[PDB]
């Protein structure tokens, strides 16, 4: 381009290859489970009388 | 039920953040002097907020 426009890319090429910044991302996935199952229960059989 | 909650700058966020994190340790905590009691098994606990 015209050194007018060299000089106006320069700057634009000078800022838009800046050094670009690094992150460190650390997630953390914490989980917690459990629960209580209960069956209890109780069969009365009788031969003369009924049964459950 | 819906419960929004508005994060205007960053120092909300943590405070936010960290009694989640916190409510979340203070459980693992629990779930240590639980299985402490009962021995023979190991649940493992995030650290202190910010220690990593």
């Not at chain 1, 007018?4 to 700057?11: F, I, P, R, S, Y």
Request: no cysteine.
């Amino acid at each position: 381009a015209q050194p007018d426009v060299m000089a106006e890319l320069e700057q634009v090429v000078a800022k838009l290859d800046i050094r670009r910044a690094q992150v460190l991302v650390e997630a953390i996935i914490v989980e917690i489970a459990d629960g209580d199952g209960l069956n209890l229960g109780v069969q009365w059989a009788n031969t003369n009388g009924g049964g459950t | 039920f819906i419960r929004p909650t508005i994060l205007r700058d960053a120092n909300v966020y943590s405070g936010i953040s960290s009694n989640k994190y916190t409510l979340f340790r203070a459980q693992q905590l629990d779930a240590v002097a639980q299985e402490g009691y009962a021995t023979s098994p190991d649940r493992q606990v995030l650290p202190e907020y910010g220690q990593d």
